[PDB]
């Protein structure tokens, strides 16, 4: 909260103030991913970042740290055996995938980056080896299996592994640069740093009607029934909000919020930055191959504070006091996961990520009607789990928030049971579906205790025998809970 996030994060300080003006302007909480000081020496330098071609991260030490280099030994793959080559085959496969703007060049740097860690107390620069017809600056590090070598009058890190000892990757090479790919912006050199990232985005509720057109919002005010008045925030925003564009260029946002992020990334230009796109994709959990759960989350409120969190248990309160537990906006990242069981799309991710272990599953490459009806019944799973994590519920009272946030949890569990009411399905999914039914029993329970319901979940489930309707079988779920 304020001072404790500006000192410990390691970001650029003048640009977080440049994001602060739009927060007063457009009433937005702007979440962030923590990035270190070694990368933001390059962010304050004016170099652009990578897109989403390679997925390495920023090294904790180094004059070349913060980059996505050729060899991934100088990055987050530090101390791995095959991942330092599985990552080395990742950026070399970005050559033949994103070709058209991928180059091949030594890094862009200054000569004053060798004194960056001399005042940090990290690396010890020792003996000096002579080659290239020049008094050359050999230098050591904390690891003796990799040492840097930066020239005295150039910007190249012409490093090597020590030739008297063995490489841990398995290679054998002398004093050599990093051939990091470049962003060929009009031919100007700009190699690829690990990009300044996000964690989520959350404006106020007010700017929704001022961003998306209120020509249809003048028809939801002309709606008599309150339950179907909440259908006006439902279907108008399904075709507006969740119509993403997952790419490798700017960030997975819709056209009412993708237009807003470049406004957040233009206030850095006149106050320090010269490299344009410093934020090039979305969240930490918008790594589209696997999510990365964190403890440290940075955010600037609409009023101007650098809010620092400590654990997610505080952030699960900070979601349920500011993000979802307040008159605000829940635009999140798309058995003790006490508030966040993973998404329907991550259940779709967890669908495939266990059937690649064994063949026998729920529905396969077959032609039986029961297999596609189970595919038709998992269609209602993801469609109803979407309204679990949905900010279409604060329009009415906070009772109407928590009513529909478990009404789908009742409405899914019967369809979950109807998926479980099938043939003898193999336990790569059935025992995975026992993990499905137990936590959905748990999150409805904690909600019912925080509310004043005082009913067990299993008693209420046998009350709600909903056949197909929500026009009365939400109302009989209403009339059991509300009016008290």
Rounded to 5°, the CA angle 61-67-72 comes to: 80
Query: What whole-number distance in Å separates Cα of residue 277 and Cα of residue 47?
Result: 9
CB 333 within 8 A of CB 200: yes
- Phi, psi angles (nearest 5°) of residue 433: -80, -20
CB 483 within 8 A of CB 404: no
Binding site listing for Mg(2+): 195, 197, 281
CB 36 within 8 A of CB 58: yes
In which order are the strands placed within the sheet that holds 298-300? 201-203, 28-32, 298-300, 306-308
| Nearest in space to 317 (alpha carbons), one of 302, 307, 303 | 307
Rounded to 5°, the CA angle 109-41-46 comes to: 65
Catalytic residues: 55
Query: What whole-number distance in Å separates Cα of residue 482 and Cα of residue 399?
Result: 8
Beta bridge partners of 32: 298
CB 193 within 8 A of CB 50: yes
| Nearest in space to 364 (alpha carbons), one of 410, 415, 428 | 428
Query: What whole-number distance in Å separates Cα of residue 189 and Cα of residue 202?
Result: 35
Six-digit token string for 241: 């909000």
Six-digit token string for 65: 């740290």
- Rg of the chain (C-alpha set): 27
Q: Given in angstroms, what resolution was this structure solved at? A: 3.4
Query: What whole-number distance in Å separates Cα of residue 406 and Cα of residue 388?
Result: 7
- Phi, psi angles (nearest 5°) of residue 300: -110, 125
C-alpha dihedral sign at 259, 261, 262, 264: positive
Query: What whole-number distance in Å separates Cα of residue 406 and Cα of residue 134?
Result: 72
Six-digit token string for 178: 């990093």
- Phi, psi angles (nearest 5°) of residue 167: -80, 140
C-alpha dihedral sign at 427, 430, 434, 435: positive
| Nearest in space to 231 (alpha carbons), one of 215, 218, 220, 240 | 220
Cα–Cα separations (whole angstroms), residue 1 to 80, 118, 294, 307: 36, 31, 18, 4
Give the distance from CA 222 to its chain's centroid. 38
Query: What whole-number distance in Å separates Cα of residue 215 and Cα of residue 117?
Result: 57
Cα–Cα separations (whole angstroms), residue 83 to 54, 89, 226, 402: 13, 9, 55, 44
CB 299 within 8 A of CB 29: yes
Query: What whole-number distance in Å separates Cα of residue 345 and Cα of residue 343?
Result: 5
Beta bridge partners of 102: 183
Binding site listing for 3',5'-cyclic AMP: 252, 281-283
Report the largest interatomic distance among the alpha carbons of the chain, rounded to a whole angstrom: 88
Q: Give the 3-state DSSP-derived string for the chain, with helices as H, strands as E and coil as C.
A: CCHHHHHHCCCCHHHHHHHHHHHHHHCEEEEECCCCHHHHHHHCCCCCECCCCCCCCCCCCCCCCCECCCCHHHCCCCCCCCHHHHCHHHHCCCCCCCCCCECCCCCCCCHHHCCCCCCCCCCCCCCCCCECCECCCECCCCCCCCECEECCCCCCECCECCCCCCCCCCCCCCCCCCCCCEECECCECCECECCECCCCEEECCHHHHHHCCCCCHHHHCCCCCHHHHCCCCCHHHHCCCCCCCCCCCCCCCCCCCHHHHHHHCCCCCCCCCCCCCCECCCCCCCCCCCCCCCCCCEEECCCCCEEECCCHHHHHHHHHHHHCCCCCCCCCCCCCCCCCCCCHHHHHHHHHHHHCCCCCCCCCCCCCHHHHHHHHHCHHHHHHHCCCCCCCCCCCCHHHHHHHHHHHHHHHHHHHHHHHCCCCCCCCCHHHHHHHHHHHHHHHHHHHHHCCCCCCHHHHHHHCCCCCCCCCCCHHHHHHHCCC
Binding site listing: 195, 197, 252, 281-283
Tell me whether residue 343 is exposed, middle or buried, using C-beta atoms within 10 angstroms of its C-beta: 0 to 12, 13 to 18, 19 or more: buried
- Specify the experimental method: cryo-EM
**CB-CB neighbours of 470 under 10 Å:** 14
Beta bridge partners of 150: 157
Query: What whole-number distance in Å separates Cα of residue 379 and Cα of residue 390?
Result: 18
């Amino acid at each position: 909260k304020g001072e404790k996030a500006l000192k410990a994060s390691g970001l650029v300080p003048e640009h977080a103030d440049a994001f602060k003006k739009i927060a007063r302007e457009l009433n937005t909480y702007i979440l962030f991913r923590p990035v270190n000081k070694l990368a933001t020496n390059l962010i304050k330098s004016g170099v652009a970042t990578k897109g989403l071609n390679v997925h390495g991260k920023s090294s904790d030490w180094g004059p070349v740290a913060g980059y996505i280099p050729f060899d991934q030994d100088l990055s987050k793959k530090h101390g791995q055996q095959l991942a330092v080559e599985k990552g080395n085959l990742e950026n070399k496969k970005s050559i033949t995938e994103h070709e058209g703007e991928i180059g091949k060049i030594p890094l862009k740097l200054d000569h004053l980056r060798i004194e960056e860690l001399k005042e940090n107390g990290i690396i010890l620069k020792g003996k000096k080896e002579i080659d290239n017809g020049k008094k050359y600056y050999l230098l050591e590090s904390n690891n003796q299996v990799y040492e840097f070598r930066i020239s005295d009058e150039n910007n190249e890190v012409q490093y090597k592994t020590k030739e008297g000892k063995i490489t841990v990757l398995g290679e054998k090479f002398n004093w050599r640069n990093i051939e990091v790919m470049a962003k060929n912006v009009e031919g100007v050199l700009k190699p690829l740093t690990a990009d300044y990232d996000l964690f989520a985005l959350a404006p106020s509720l007010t700017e929704i009607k001022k961003q998306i057109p209120q020509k249809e919002w003048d028809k939801v005010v002309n709606t008599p029934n309150s339950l179907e008045k909440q259908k006006g925030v439902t279907n108008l925003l399904i075709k507006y909000g969740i119509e993403r564009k997952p790419d490798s260029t700017k960030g997975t946002l819709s056209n009412w919020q993708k237009q807003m992020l470049d406004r957040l990334n233009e206030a850095v230009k006149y106050t320090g930055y010269t490299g344009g796109d410093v934020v090039n994709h979305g969240t930490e959990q918008d790594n589209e191959e696997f999510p990365e759960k964190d403890n440290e989350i940075f955010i600037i409120n609409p009023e101007g504070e650098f809010i620092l969190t400590k654990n997610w248990e505080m952030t699960g309160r900070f979601i349920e006091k500011n993000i979802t537990g307040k008159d605000y906006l829940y635009y999140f990242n798309r058995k003790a996961k006490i508030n966040t069981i993973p998404t329907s799309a991550e259940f779709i991710k967890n669908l495939s990520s266990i059937r690649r272990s064994s063949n026998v599953g729920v529905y396969k490459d077959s032609g039986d009607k029961d297999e596609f009806a189970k595919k038709e019944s998992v269609k209602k799973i993801a469609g109803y789990l979407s309204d679990y994590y949905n900010s279409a519920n604060h329009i009415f009272s906070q009772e109407k928030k928590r009513k529909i946030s478990i009404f789908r949890g009742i409405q899914a569990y019967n369809e979950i049971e109807n998926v479980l009411k099938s043939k003898q399905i193999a336990p790569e999914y059935k025992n995975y579906f026992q993990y499905l039914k137990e936590r959905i029993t748990n999150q409805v329970q904690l909600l019912l205790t925080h509310q004043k319901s005082n009913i067990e979940f299993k008693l209420l489930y046998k009350q709600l025998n909903f056949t197909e309707n929500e026009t009365d079988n939400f109302e009989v779920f209403q009339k059991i809970i509300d009016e008290k």
